Symmetry: none
């Protein structure tokens, strides 16, 4: 059913539970034998249980503690998305972050901590095992200051423009080449003409968008934005959505994926 | 006299001694608070105790161990040079090397190791603290991808120098350098400029009967420098033997533009008795 | 601008190039038009910059031999394959500088042979808004191919694997992120599951692919493959197609655009 | 060797005279058969009469006219330096300049012109034949079109500080590796201790420097500065000097060459 949406969202939360629990066998158990992990998105991906154990053991050693937001489901029978707020001891991974220039080295590495906020995109198979997990976070999500954090601005510009009914200003945020899915799981659309019809539909039933602060991938190719969205017609409803936008060399929107599930809509009535 | 020379050499060995010991505070103690580190030369430099700890902690974590050759001193009251052979766990720095294309990632990273040979050029102040440390190594000085490609083409410049000058082929040696060449030998005395000065140095060299035997060279990461430890003997005015390390900065076309021959008074041996 | 008009216009462009008149050429471009030649270099904009780009070529007596264009099913695109020959002077020296070409011994008599794919976007009046010219170092003579030759290999592999029906071997050529339009103008397919269903249909209808030698962009991020494709079912048909594939870090297929027009399908054989 | 300073300075002007004359054979005759030309410094050099004809014919074709300043000599029996202001028709070279990004292409190429100001550094052999000619100019020296103009500022900073007696601030403009000739023909000094002493004599004799607007190489590695310099001790004298400074990664001066001839010292000026 669309009850399997709940299954994926449950497994998503279980992942966070097992991390906080610290049991490494319990964590690896959630993964297919051949799963693929990108953390953070932009680093070369990593494959197989051995590599997972290698990635997760130092984190568990740093007493990583995760606070999970409410997941949302994709309408594709595989995906659940979940935002995480992390804290860990700066050692032993901190130094590697600094060595990559992601983080300014602390004065007292034995007492420093590392705070992170990331978006987890988890692709599961019918048995609920994780096949591919993407963790989206960049330097502005670690312990809005780069010329590349104004690429986070593109999330504010979209919502602000669309709430005003400024369709052309929305269309300007994207390449003429634009591919978009909304919801992820239904056939996608291409080019600013389809998008215009999508957005004209949106304005007419009265949609209103409110983003939470976005995250980026590490290479700033991607901007991840949780929004809450309301519509008036054909029924007052509220949607919990997380939208991923891939950017081109000029900061234009190349691809958009709006993740929200049937269990992410509320028929509010007041 | 050259007593400060031994101080620096001893300190160079102590640095390696503290690495193998694994105590990170002991290591940072050898460094001035504003010290500058380039490891490998070619990567943008790094400054201050905080950045040093970020650099040394993952290395120590990989149980890095060092075998040091016996240092040489520079004749300027600051410099000591020392060759190092390292081995460390592939994790956690290995992945960082693989990302940069310095390395081909191994098929069992959890048990793999990384061998490196480098030349450390250490500048100390009058108190013996490190002010500036340059670590010379490149892709052909790294086990994981000896892939001597066009880096081997620049390492050949070391073999040519020794072979040609041993043969007295002064002009073939001069062909190895820019007409702009700057040449200190020893470092700490005023250098010569241009191939006319260089020719006379080399004419002198051949006449005193100098004979060079180089160790295998190292390069920087960007292959702009070629580091060559040599042993050199001369017959006149006195049979002597020098332990030298020569650093050559190359130009766009691989020509030798700047050369620094590091050796101290305590790196010479009087022979034939 | 139906499919026929756009194709005819593509040849007209090549005709005016052979005609040698620079004014006639610029007349075909919107005043704010954009040119990329080769794809991978920064673009060029506006009639003034266009004159700067074409004048040295025309002085070198550039003569093009054009293949039959194909149309995109999107009311804007015509694509056309080009073979060039021109004097080595005055641009050849500039190519040698960039490492694209080995300087010749008798530059006063040398020629430059080039094969490129022109992707031409026209607006409704038939003026060119955006022109992309795909050619790389292995498509220039006066080929080398170092890693281009392995990324060019990806086209030979696709056709060969799919001809044998090795569906899973085909999927391995692409990322899980894959976007596949086929034809451009109909809604695209997302993910290897869509792609599997597409490839199963392809295999079942008896598709057989025969590629011309591919081209790349200059940065080898794109591989352009003209193929002739025949199917047996539901009828023996023949498609004239050109495929543009965007590659990632590891030479995998990120996005695929298969251009072919309604007027590019016949009931022939080969 | 032969060719005194007056001889070399006159040959410098004769070269320019023959350029304006338009006879290509006459120009080439001034060059050794194996001579080397760099125009501009930063591009690969060209060698031998044959390449030279190839370099000069398009320039003469655009009716290149030169206004030559008064040369200076090097005190080394080989070098003469001379500043040139060029003008030529935009065709035939202009389009190629624009292709490399040195120029914004004009609207009317058949009437446009190209203005250039460069410093020619000419090495002649004992017969007065040119062995090596370097032409220093960059985009900021071309009627294009300021690039890393902050790299041109190092001339104003040098002059202002040494005029003020601010030795340490002057020394701050150079690497500790600094190699300094002054005049070219006298043995060079290395390192800031030597340079400090040189500058102390300079300040004690009351030197005062007035720079003309500098030029750069194309790759902005070199800053060429014509100055007139006056001293008060032991007699009030005036020097016509042109200084070449090679910069490092961070814009520090790594090598400096002060060209001035025995015939460039006068008793005149204010």
């Amino acid at each position: 059913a669309a009850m399997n949406e709940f299954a994926r969202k449950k497994r998503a939360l279980e992942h966070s539970r097992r991390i906080n629990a610290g049991d490494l066998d319990a964590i690896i158990d959630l993964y297919a034998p051949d799963a693929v992990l990108e953390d953070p998105v932009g680093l070369p991906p990593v494959t197989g249980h051995d590599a997972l154990r290698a990635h997760y053991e130092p984190l568990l050693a740093a007493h990583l503690r995760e606070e999970a937001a409410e997941p949302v489901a994709g309408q594709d029978a595989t995906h659940a998305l979940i935002q995480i707020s992390s804290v860990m001891d700066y050692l032993p991974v901190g130094p590697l972050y600094a060595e990559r220039g992601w983080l300014k080295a602390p004065d007292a590495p034995g007492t420093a901590r590392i705070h992170r906020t990331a978006m987890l995109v988890i692709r599961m198979d019918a048995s609920g095992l994780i096949r591919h997990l993407k963790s989206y976070w960049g330097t502005s999500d670690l312990s809005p200051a780069a010329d590349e954090a104004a690429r986070k601005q593109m999330a504010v510009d979209y919502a602000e423009r669309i709430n005003a009914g400024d369709i052309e200003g929305v269309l300007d945020l994207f390449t003429d080449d634009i591919v978009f899915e909304d919801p992820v799981g239904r056939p996608p659309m291409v080019g600013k003409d389809d998008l215009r019809r999508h957005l004209e539909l949106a304005v007419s039933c009265g949609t209103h968008e409110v983003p939470d602060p976005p995250m980026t991938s590490m290479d700033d190719r991607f901007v991840v934005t949780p929004t809450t969205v309301t519509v008036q017609r054909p029924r007052p409803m509220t949607f919990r959505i997380v939208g991923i936008v891939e950017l081109d060399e000029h900061g234009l929107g190349r691809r958009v994926q709006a993740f929200w599930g049937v269990t992410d809509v509320t028929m509010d009535d007041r």
